[PDB]
Symmetry: C3
Subunit: 452 residues, 3 copies
């Protein structure tokens, strides 16, 4: 009776780069099949506008700020990671009988205690850092050359992939390999006779922009070189989703599986993505940076052919997956999301009269976002707080703060209140970022929460 | 095992009760408890303002040791006095006591920081730093703001609660809290365990709002604010009388230890008087953290006496624990002492031991050390001063120049004591925390410099 | 079957100040006996180039940076110490049946929970601070005079020694007393019928430079006054080692005991030491500061008359002692060392293709060191990173970074990677050091890891 759960996460997939969310040029039929026979979300938000903190939030069900994970891990490697006392959704499900697998991108710590096998994943196949070169014919020779030279700090994008701690020699284009291993996983799950949970973390369409010629050949009308490469990268994900769906059907798993497909953040416009109609992209507190595509699919439980128009947070997946699995959640875990299912079924706002936050730090100041009901408050580029009616003004073109003073001020002060239990960052993505953090007396919330 | 009542007035000045020298405000019911018990001429709180003082009372620890050196953010927060420091209420509750808290909290409004999770079976009051006194005034303002859609409403006008459910209060807040203190000790009769009551009045803290009937009792007080203040204190005294008539009615009075005190010194610009002490609220001068206190407990606490040796608010935790038969573990790191053995023998419970105060400011800190007859003072970025506080209670005569070695030794022991102070877990305003970080605080290089 | 273990640690013993490690002037025959019938180490490194952090590392098996112990404890006293959640090697061995003793210098916290008896030492005899005056005839009168004056913050070098928390009145030159108590310990261990572990932490030859006339009389050819005093101090250690060895033989303990003799850091050149052929000394990331003498001795298990030429870290003693004792180590402990025994027996590098680090903080910047295989990277005096082939260039005279850019950069980046789990310091050795730490936004790893 308890359903299987598949969380598919594309990396830097732009808002307009799947068909079901308005793509005019990239075609994603297998992903679209899941949308057409399920529900898509027009107001889905991640907890942070870039990779590491967004992913920390997905797994922990907590705003990354609450657990010191506001920054990506140090790009050249580290002995730190998402804190081990915050129980991952995989570990919870595993403790309630689920068979658990994770594939592809991790970027939440490479130490023994931060490794997927210790965060409640029985199976893991992928690469532990922030991304990876896509062609083994290219990356394996570079790693061979650097290792034989004696070097220990080798760029994590060319290191060998692993399976449960043992290295492997990958042969296929990485997107295809991860898809293949997703098939292998759900095939292994047939014999287990428990429900299963799969975290499928594709690196596509994250840099570097490397695509197969066979995928790029499907977009002859895309004249721009990078956009074409990107299109091929996304299509490879779509082929993967089709390959996984044929395997689920083969095993009679398809009907009792909740599939969630989403992005971890907004697309990067300078690396082939499109976020139409949203402003800006990756790393912004504008909508482009943390409003993402999402679909649910689960026959007879998730309504087919619908589009859910109320705010949903990536933080909601933790308690929602838990509720659907029959897993008790303790109050000592401090989950920032909500079980969105009661409100989803009744077609009501699961965050009625409640804020959804984004807060991205920069050098000496912070950009911020608040989404509640129809309203979107925006703090960006050291400007005064702006307010938009995001239902009417999705592109954030018309600041109506001047005629809503009390409402905006109230929203900012509630964020100010919310800020106090944010931990100091446990790391930064670069050594100079942490020096500057300390030099600038951060967080400079005097700037961030100043009002009229 | 005795019942225990800790009554705490908020910003009650040193000279604003009769038993501690008031010439103008009259407090007969409070004075009754003094007359038939023991008052304390050298009683000190752990910090010269509300939040950290109260954190210390409940935890038995200097607030600096647990990151609670500042009042909680004035516009609300998700933080509070850390949950791993067990409150005296929780300890007593685990040793069979029925536990109640009334009025002011100001130690965290989250589920895990709420009174019901800090070991209080009953709670009636308001969770923030204070409250407007008249429901006729505050409830319409809250109705208007709530219907407007606003979520960050000023905590002084929000509705009071009883164990997490809201209520619609009808009386002047001081009288309501007194009434609920009666209701509590009445509920305690049927329980047949001993009880503990934390009665945290907001009077005479701002705003200065008094009943006309109380102000009418001070026709000779010409100053408007002092009159209002006087009426506010008198309302507390009426409350204490109403509680005492209830204790007698239930035959609880004879087996109850009542402690009446202030959380800190009075604020001179808001109607208080701290005579004969210098300065007031927030100072490391005596005015800021030397407070009135009485114990009352028939046959156990001597009647009509005045105890002249130093006592700390930190002492109430282990002293209440000892009197209740509650074991205290060393892993708790209590900074106070069980003052009862020394109290009975009329000896100094802190003989040859310092009592500290340390209040932070913008880019520097003021400090105080009280040991035996001596009072060391660091204030206003001046050199350390020393006073013989037995002879010189008003701190008029700095005798540091002729006691160099002693002063230096005292400061160095404070310097030693400072190292396990945690970084603050919050500040009362966002700018205070920014400045803390900008100024590289604590600037203990200034605070512990000697010559 | 399970061996006894003795860790003898001299304090600030210079690289060239024992015979077995090249001394031409100081003579140390009993120490040399252990070298001659065992193995010495030419490439032995401690975890930090000064006392407190080095010792924290020895006991915890962790780089002191990982546990907030990068600085010596506050010189005038404190309520902090090496964190209690990092299990000491003594506690581990004690939990696996060993009888445990510690002698002399502690300098890892003087509070109840940081005291030797709570860090897994059944027996303790010594002084809790960073050093001590050597002659009871001199120091006890000064302490008597200051205590009777009323002072509480008395210089830790003159305070009385203790035995398991009770004070004593020591009569002998401190080095001789500690040696005597080491005898007393191994005599007490005979009756126990378990294996034993002894941490013998001499303060010699740390300042102050105080020696017996009888020891100084053995070096008539040393014309320099301080070097002679120093020589006598080291000789007193050597007499102690002989006195301990005669006791081990008397009890038939000698043959089944692993004796490790080492220094906690490099010698201080301005206080009588010699670090030949190494550059600089105490507190430097040059070799002089953290490359130290070490010998192992254990008959039939440790090869006799050999000299091990591969890198060994003080961090290795924790897991190596554990493995030899049959004590399981959990991964949750985060040991930074390795069990060096498999590689030691095969005469292979126990840290093949693995770095050994040093990182000493200063005012506004940090000096650093990396030792891997033949290479030594050096960050000193705010200069660019240097690289030496330490096999060819032990004195660090010839920077070959200009022709090995990729290798140096790779080494620094691996240190940069390693730095991220370093905790903020939990204390500093002086109040102004911590203020400056905060003012200068430390750690300034932007300077420390620039390439
Ligand atoms: Ca991403
Ligand atoms: Ca107060
Ligand atoms: Ca030393």
């Amino acid at each position: 009776q308890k359903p299987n759960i598949i969380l598919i996460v594309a990396d830097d997939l732009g808002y307009a780069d799947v068909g079901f969310n308005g793509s005019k040029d990239i075609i994603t039929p297998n992903i679209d099949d899941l949308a057409k026979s399920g529900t898509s979300f027009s107001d889905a938000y991640v907890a942070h506008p870039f990779c590491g903190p967004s992913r920390a939030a997905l797994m922990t069900g907590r705003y990354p700020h609450k657990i010191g994970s506001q920054f990506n891990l140090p790009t050249r490697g580290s002995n730190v990671g998402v804190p081990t006392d915050a129980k991952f959704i995989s570990k919870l499900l595993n403790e309630n009988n689920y068979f658990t697998g994770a594939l592809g991108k991790w970027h939440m710590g490479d130490t023994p205690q931060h490794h997927p096998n210790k965060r409640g994943f029985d199976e893991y196949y992928g690469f532990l850092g922030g991304g990876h070169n896509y062609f083994p014919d290219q990356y394996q020779p570079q790693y061979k050359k650097q290792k034989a030279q004696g070097l220990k700090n080798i760029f994590e994008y060319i290191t060998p992939l692993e399976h449960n701690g043992k290295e492997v020699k990958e042969t296929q284009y990485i997107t295809d390999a991860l898809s293949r291993e997703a098939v292998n996983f759900v095939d292994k799950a047939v014999n287990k006779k428990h429900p299963f949970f799969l975290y499928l973390a594709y690196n596509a369409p994250h840099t570097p922009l490397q695509a197969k010629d066979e995928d790029m050949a499907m977009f002859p009308n895309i004249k721009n070189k990078d956009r074409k490469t990107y299109a091929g990268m996304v299509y490879a994900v779509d082929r993967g989703v089709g390959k996984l769906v044929e395997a689920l059907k083969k095993n009679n798993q398809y009907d009792n599986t909740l599939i969630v497909f989403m992005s971890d953040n907004g697309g990067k416009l300078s690396k082939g993505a499109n976020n139409f109609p949203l402003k800006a992209g990756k790393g912004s507190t504008q909508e482009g940076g943390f409003r993402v595509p999402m679909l649910f699919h689960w026959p007879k439980h998730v309504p087919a052919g619908k589009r859910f128009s109320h705010p949903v947070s990536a933080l909601d997946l933790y308690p929602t997956f838990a509720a659907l699995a029959g897993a008790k959640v303790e109050e000592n875990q401090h989950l920032d999301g909500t079980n969105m299912w009661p409100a989803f079924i009744k077609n009501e706002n699961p965050h009625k009269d409640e804020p959804i936050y984004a807060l991205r730090h920069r050098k000496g100041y912070s950009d911020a976002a608040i989404r509640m009901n129809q309203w979107k408050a925006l703090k960006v580029n050291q400007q005064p707080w702006q307010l938009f009616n995001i239902e009417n003004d999705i592109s954030e073109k018309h600041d109506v703060s001047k005629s809503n003073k009390a409402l905006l001020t109230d929203m900012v002060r509630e964020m100010e209140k919310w800020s106090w239990d944010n931990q100091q960052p446990s790391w930064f993505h670069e050594t100079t970022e942490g020096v500057n953090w300390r030099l600038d007396a951060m967080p400079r919330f005097d700037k961030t929460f100043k009002t009229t």
